[PDB]
Structure formats: C-alpha cells, structure tokens
Design a protein around this ligand. Structure first.
Ligand SMILES: *[C@@H]1O[C@H](CO)[C@@H](O)[C@H](O)[C@H]1NC(C)=O
Lengths: 258, 13, 43
C-alpha cells in the first residue's frame, strides 16, 4: 500500500494473507467471506507465462494477522486449503479479465475479534455506491512504494496498511492505459492533480477493496486488487475485479463446490 | 534471513 | 440483512457479515471511516 497508514487492530478482520509453503513467501492478499471460503485474485494462483499454477497443497492462508512477518500466536490462524477454484474464463493472456479465485479451507475457521467475514455486494449496494468519486478502502502488506531508493527495507511494511481511494470514471480509466478494460473491472485512485496520493502495490493483489454501506452499516467487498502499471504513478490508476459482476460464478462454485 | 518468523507445524489449524 | 447463499455449502457467517467485533459491534468507529461516508454524501 502506497501512502496508506498503519491499520488499527481488527479494522479489517476479513483480511487474509496468502502464504506460499516453500519457499516461505507472502504471495498476495485475500478476503474471508465465510468460515469456509476465501476470495483472492486468479493471477495470484495461475499464470502460465511464469509457469505459475499453485495447487491447494502449495499454500496456506493466514487469517487474523496484523504484523507482516511475526508469528502472531494465539491471534492469527494458519489454515490449509482443501481446494482452489480459478474462474474458468480468467483471461491471463490479454488483460486479466475475470481475475478471481475461490479458496476452500480444509476446516472451518472460528471467528474472533480479529477474524470475521466481509459481505459480498447486492445490486442495491452496487448501484448506490460503486460510482465515480465514491471512496473504498484497500488493505494489504504490499510494498510502500513502487521501488526503493537506498535500502530494500524502506519499502516493506512492518504491519498491515490501509488506504482510502476514490472510484474513477470509466472513460478516464480507459484513457489511462493501453490495456483493454472490460466491464468485469473498475479502477480507483486520485487524479493526476489531487492533493492526495495512494494506491495498492506489489503484494496487495488479491486483497479487498471495501465500502461501508450507510444503509445497514456493514462493510462490503466491491473489488479485489487486480493490477496496475507501477504503483502510485500520476495519470495511472489501480484496477480491480468487479466482484458483483462475478457473483453468479461465486454462487455456482460454492453450492457446487467446484 | 527468514523474512518470516517460524511457526510450529503443530499450530496449523 | 438478506442472505444469498446456503449455509450448508457456504458455511457460517453470512448473516453477520460486515460487522466488525472491535468497531461496529462496540459502536466504535475507526479513524478514517468518515472519509468514506463523506464521499458518498458530498454530491
Ligand atoms: C494446473 O495443474 C493441474 C493439476 O496438475 C492440471 O489439471 C491443470 O491442467 C493445470 N493448469 C494449467 C492451465 O496449466
């Protein structure tokens, strides 16, 4: 997260860490949507060009974390995965269209003050809040800047970061990149000349872009951090998987269990 | 230099 | 709140989703959630 700030404990209890077993590595962010299912980005799991195709036996999820590197004994929970389901029409070759995957936990995870699921959006919530200028919040343990100056450590956070970002008009998103933007994605970030700056970065992918509905006071996950061209580059915006649009697929997989 | 603090195999859910 | 999935396959949690134990449940707001609400109303 660039230009974000340290998270308060429990500020995003659905935040999950996708952790590679070997070598040990923080791969991406992710979100808890129930005590058995976790949502993340498909490119965090499958990417043929780099021979990437992680299976359920290759990774773990760490739930309830705050520190990026410490083992938060008695607070976090480390779970194995039973199965992983990548969207069948995820377009890795061209634009990462439908960048979403569901991870099914081996055992359901007990909730706590630091472990609690986020809501998936309904039509009403999407039509009233997913509009240009409305702010969503992104969290993650990703890099603090696109790159470092002197030492690598200056850009690795010690704890989970949070940043608030405004949704950007579709024509503007389209004009900012050569990539073909589909209806399955939306973009956010401050304009080429706002006071504020902020964006997701390397390591935040798969994490959630959330909004708090004024209608029922609940937090909804409207997007999944998907991709960007650099981090916090003026004139560029971060792109997100439009979760509501892929809700039917989520429902299909869950009740089918893939 | 282990970015990550180790955790016991016994502690995994 | 209206549920959309089936507990049997979705697991537990839908009915209570989005409500944070250390915030909403305690009637406490975090340091920056107001910025989000301000942006939904200003206009
Ligand atoms: C990923 O590996 C699985 C399990 O070995 C295999 O069935 C599938 O074809 C692989 N995915 C791709 C697109 O390479």
């Amino acid at each position: 997260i660039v230009e974000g700030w340290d998270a308060e404990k429990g500020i995003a209890p659905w935040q999950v860490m996708l952790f590679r077993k070997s070598p040990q590595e923080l791969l991406c962010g992710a979100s808890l949507i129930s005590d058995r299912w976790v949502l993340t980005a498909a490119h965090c799991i499958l990417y043929p060009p780099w021979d990437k195709n992680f299976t359920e036996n290759d990774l773990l999820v760490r739930i309830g974390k705050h520190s990026r590197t410490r083992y938060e004994r008695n607070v976090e929970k480390i779970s194995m995965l039973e199965k992983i389901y990548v969207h069948p029409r995820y377009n890795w070759r061209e634009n990462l269209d439908r960048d979403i995957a569901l991870l099914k936990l081996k055992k359901p995870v007990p909730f706590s003050d630091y472990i609690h699921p986020v809501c998936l959006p309904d039509k009403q919530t999407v039509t009233s809040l997913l509009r240009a200028g409305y702010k969503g919040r992104v969290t993650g343990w990703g890099n603090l800047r696109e790159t470092w100056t002197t030492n690598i450590n200056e850009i690795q956070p010690s704890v989970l970061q949070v940043v608030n970002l405004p949704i950007v008009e579709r024509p503007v998103c389209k004009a900012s990149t050569r990539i073909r933007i589909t209806d399955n994605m939306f973009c956010a970030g401050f304009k080429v000349n706002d006071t504020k700056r902020g964006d997701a970065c390397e390591g935040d992918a798969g994490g959630p872009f959330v909004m708090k509905s004024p209608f029922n006071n609940r937090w909804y996950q409207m997007g999944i951090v998907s991709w960007g061209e650099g981090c916090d580059r003026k004139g560029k915006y971060g792109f997100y998987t439009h979760v509501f649009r892929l809700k039917r697929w989520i429902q299909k997989v869950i009740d089918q269990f893939g | 230099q282990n970015t990550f603090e180790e955790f016991p195999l016994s502690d995994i859910e | 709140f209206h549920t959309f999935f089936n507990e049997k396959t979705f697991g537990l949690g839908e009915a209570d989703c989005g409500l944070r134990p250390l915030f909403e449940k305690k009637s406490l707001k975090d340091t920056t959630e107001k910025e989000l609400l301000d942006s939904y109303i200003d206009g």
